Design a protein around this nucleic acid. Structure first.
Lengths: 150, 102, 64, 192, 228, 51, 120
RNA sequence: CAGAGUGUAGCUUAACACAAAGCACCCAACUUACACUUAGGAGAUUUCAACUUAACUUGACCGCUCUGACCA
């Protein structure tokens, strides 16, 4: 009861959660992992995802990019017609992180590049300006947002 | 989806199963030390970095605020993985053509 | 029926019309597709969708 | 009208500032273990234990049993660690443990259990039946010397009595067999 | 002012060019991963090719067979020669060339003369007013003798600090000591010229870094230098 | 260390066999990747268009 | 004929029992508790005691869980406890170690279901 | 270099004795990945003594930290 000293003991929503990058922290980073081997690209992203959690770094999203198929054509022996030799598939994995301090950036960048396996490309770009963060919303999430406007 | 690509599953001998089983238990301890070294490596970098900043603040408070700011020129950062063999100083690749399929 | 939509947001202001939509989907579309968040049926003003969800959807069908 | 609480709030220690950078439970089992711990703690508000828990006196129940035996922890621990290493040295035990085919001998475990922590478990088990509550009005004692009582049923079968086991009066028509480990020259007193 | 001099040090490191050789335990696990992979994978297009030909040949228009095609690939591999993972510089123990120890990270050391004595330290430059502390570390590259290299600086905060005092000879109220701040960077491309190599600079790992650094100076450098 | 997460396997329920192969680049460098055929080495040729 | 503490339909676990088999498995040790509805513990069997630890290669494997049940089931008969309830989570029920612990109790003479209370 | 201080594997005011505990960590399966769960793995009292229980107390020994000396 409100008048009782034990009022508010059952309150729980204040313990439940309902981007801009400052001059001290990086806002949004997209870690692109390009490699022709699908197992190596998936594994390194898995290691980075585990590494970020261990260092108390929030991972916004872990997804993959569409595969880019590149045919390799080589000149025929004593001729002028290009013949098919091999087909290479380009696989890319993206790990998005947010909440990285400027000072800790040097340590984080050194750890990932040291652990980068052979044949895997590391590419981190500031894509906070791109935005386009269109994600499908659930009903309980959407209901609360409308109540704010109402 | 065709089942004609399926291969016969040859039965595994007890020695092979024993060898695999004992190999996985030793591999779990091997990976535990790599994380332990990596965990201490990060702490060693982090502890020295924080302590160096403390000394800089007393020496010069204005230089302390300049180092702790972000570096927009740092990103984007590109880095390639190592190779298996060093590049050949004198190598002429054969001629060819690339076609991309999307 | 196309099967090209992983997530759907079906909103009609009138709940009575919405109730008819649920029965039609239930009778025709098997429950497995509607089991998840793939089909989201809500009853709110369409004017809200211009602010609540900006740039979320690639294909929007508007039958005012 | 609001009254200030008589004590600390259950979730007052949690800081709401950096709510996003706080480790969550992420599982049902983790919350349940934390929930049980706080359910066993006293609170200034009305609780289930207040009305249904068995009331106990603030005075600690006195002990009228024999003094505990003197055991050197350092020497006792040294032998146990060596025995474990020898047990783990054998590859057959690991294979039996990995193939889930190993098992323990119940008789050997109980013989060691009866000497190490058997008296303590029996004392707790005796309290459940309210023997200390009735016989000694709450006073407790550790049964340091195990007692072996068994009734002779027929000419080859025996019905042991450990702690509260079901015994029919037909099996208890005659005096049972009473045995226990004791030193020479000591005097004892049996009671039923 | 203050009686402690500000010197902007630089920690140039060369990332490994080749992958580190696998340990004996890793070799067993890596071969195990391949063996598990085969037993849980279906027939490939080439493995089905061999089966079809064998059945047809057993009963009896494919010119090139599955087994014959594999032989051609093997012969071509033998004609191609792989690059040397162990370079001549490792054999010669020439710690001035970047070609040595491609598997491990390398740390640049330069020998400078202080008090009529040569001491190996990281490149450093005294801080100047109207300049960031990191900018002084970037100026160290320009002061290098005949260097054409591009370095990627990571962050702005210093990676370490080392403190020392004059041995009661140059100790003064105006000049009592100094504090060097270590800035780490990655060697993208380039190397020094051929004018002076041996007496100018060396490239050593963390394990062999103690030969040149002082016991007090070595302790502060091993903290921000990893050996993964 | 590049071997932090390099030793892995195909995490697929259904897939074709893959072999460890060498990919020679335009500078002579080589890397280990997986190819459908047991070709021990592959060399990427220099494109004529990019001149 | 003793009344069971019925209710608690909105919380887990339930309270409609006399004795409850509660299994606590930690990172290193596995403990099985048989306790009355009032909270008092009847009998216990854990891998922490030297009696069982000296016969177990690992105290955290399936063998340890099955071994605890075999030792506990023997002690339950000695204590006179023949019926008790087991209230696991859906994932614990599907676990292989808990299935063998249940088998050990049943093979030990203990029934994992309590008889219904007589009201009339 | 002494000067004080300090001491259970990462953490803990876990350790009455029945016992060196709990948590965190590591591998694999499941997951795009994380997480959950299941199935597994690695562990610690600085060392010796003191009438003995002594991880606990007293010094000794020993391992770290800290202020000056030493210092380019």
């Amino acid at each position: 009861y409100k008048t009782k000293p034990t009022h508010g003991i059952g309150k729980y929503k204040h313990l439940i959660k309902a981007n801009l990058g400052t001059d001290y922290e990086y806002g949004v980073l997209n870690i692109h992992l390009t490699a022709y081997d699908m197992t190596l690209a998936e594994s390194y992203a898995q290691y980075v995802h585990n590494l970020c959690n261990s260092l108390s770094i929030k991972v916004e999203e872990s997804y993959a990019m569409p595969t880019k198929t590149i045919e390799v054509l080589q000149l025929q022996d004593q001729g002028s017609k290009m013949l098919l030799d091999s087909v290479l598939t380009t696989h890319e994995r993206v790990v998005q992180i947010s909440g990285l301090s400027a000072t800790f950036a040097e340590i984080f960048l050194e750890i990932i590049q040291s652990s980068l396996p052979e044949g895997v490309r590391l590419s981190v770009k500031e894509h906070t300006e791109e935005d386009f963060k269109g994600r499908f919303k659930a009903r309980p999430e959407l209901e609360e947002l409308l109540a704010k406007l109402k | 989806l065709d089942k004609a690509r399926e291969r016969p599953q040859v039965e595994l001998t007890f020695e092979e199963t024993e060898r695999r089983a004992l190999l996985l238990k030793k591999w779990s301890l091997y990976k535990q030390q790599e994380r332990k070294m990596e965990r201490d490596t990060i702490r060693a970098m982090l502890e020295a970095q924080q302590e160096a900043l403390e000394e800089l603040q007393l020496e010069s408070p204005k230089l302390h605020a300049e180092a702790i700011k972000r570096d927009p020129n740092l990103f984007p950062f590109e880095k390639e993985g190592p190779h298996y063999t060093p590049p050949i100083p004198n190598y002429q690749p054969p001629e060819g053509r690339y076609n991309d399929i999307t | 029926q196309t099967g090209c939509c992983r997530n759907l947001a079906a909103n009609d202001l009138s709940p009575s019309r919405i109730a008819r939509l649920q029965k039609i989907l239930h009778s025709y579309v098997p429950e497995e597709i509607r089991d998840g968040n793939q089909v989201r049926v809500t009853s709110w003003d369409g004017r809200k969708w211009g602010e609540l969800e900006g740039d979320t959807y690639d294909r929007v069908l508007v039958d005012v | 009208r609001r009254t200030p609480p008589l004590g600390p709030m259950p979730n007052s220690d949690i800081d709401l500032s950096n709510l996003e950078r706080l480790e969550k439970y992420r599982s049902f089992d983790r919350y349940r273990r934390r929930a049980e711990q706080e359910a066993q703690a006293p609170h200034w508000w009305r609780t289930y234990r207040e009305y249904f828990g068995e009331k106990t006196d603030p005075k600690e129940k006195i002990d009228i049993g024999l003094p505990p035996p003197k055991v050197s922890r350092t020497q006792q621990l040294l032998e146990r660690k060596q025995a474990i290493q020898e047990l783990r040295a054998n590859v057959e035990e690991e294979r039996a443990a990995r193939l889930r085919t190993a098992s323990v001998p119940l008789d050997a475990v109980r013989a060691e259990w009866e000497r190490t922590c058997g008296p303590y478990h029996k004392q707790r088990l005796a309290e459940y039946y309210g023997l200390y509550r009735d016989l000694f009005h709450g006073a407790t004692f550790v049964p340091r010397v195990p007692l072996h009582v068994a009734y002779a049923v027929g000419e080859d079968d025996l019905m042991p009595v450990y702690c509260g086991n079901e015994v029919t009066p037909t099996e208890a028509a005659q005096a049972p067999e009473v045995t226990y480990e004791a030193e020479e020259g000591s005097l004892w007193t049996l009671l039923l | 002012g203050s009686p402690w001099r500000l010197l902007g040090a630089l920690c140039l490191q060369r990332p490994p060019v080749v992958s580190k050789p696998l340990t004996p335990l890793q070799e067993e696990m890596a071969s195990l991963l391949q063996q598990i992979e085969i037993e849980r994978s279906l027939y490939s297009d080439h493995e089905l090719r061999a089966l079809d030909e064998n059945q047809r040949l057993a009963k009896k228009q494919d010119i090139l067979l599955a087994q014959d095609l594999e032989d051609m690939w093997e012969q071509k591999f033998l004609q191609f020669k792989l690059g040397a993972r162990i370079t001549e510089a490792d054999e010669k123990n020439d710690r001035t060339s970047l070609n040595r120890k491609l598997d491990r990270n390398l740390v640049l050391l330069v020998r400078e003369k202080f008090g009529d004595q040569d001491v190996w330290i990281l490149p450093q430059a005294e801080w100047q007013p109207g300049e960031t502390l990191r900018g002084t570390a970037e100026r160290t590259l320009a002061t290098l003798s005949e260097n054409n290299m591009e370095a990627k600086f990571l962050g702005n905060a210093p990676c370490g600090h080392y403190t020392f005092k004059f041995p009661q000879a140059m100790r003064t109220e105006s000049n009592l000591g100094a504090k060097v701040f270590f800035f780490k960077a990655l060697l993208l491309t380039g190397d020094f010229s051929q004018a002076g190599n041996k007496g100018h600079h060396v490239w050593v790992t963390k394990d062999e870094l103690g030969d040149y650094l002082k016991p007090k100076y070595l302790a502060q450098v091993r903290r921000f230098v990893s050996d993964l | 260390d590049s071997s932090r997460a390099s030793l892995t396997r195909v995490h697929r329920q259904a897939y074709a066999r893959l072999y460890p192969v060498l990919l020679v680049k335009q500078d002579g460098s080589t890397i280990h990747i997986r190819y459908r055929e047991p070709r021990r080495m592959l060399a990427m040729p220099i494109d004529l268009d990019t001149l | 004929v003793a009344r069971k503490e019925r209710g608690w339909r909105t919380v887990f676990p339930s309270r409609e029992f006399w004795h409850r088999l509660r299994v606590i498995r930690t990172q290193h040790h596995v403990e099985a508790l048989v306790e009355h509805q009032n909270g008092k513990v009847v009998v216990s069997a854990s891998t922490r005691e030297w009696a069982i630890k000296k016969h177990l290669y690992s105290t955290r494997n399936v063998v340890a869980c099955e071994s605890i049940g075999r030792v506990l089931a023997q002690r339950c008969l000695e204590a006179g406890i023949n019926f008790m309830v087991y209230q696991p989570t859906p994932w614990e029920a599907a676990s292989d170690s808990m299935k063998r612990l249940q088998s050990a109790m049943t093979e030990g003479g203990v029934v994992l279901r309590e008889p219904q209370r007589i009201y009339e």
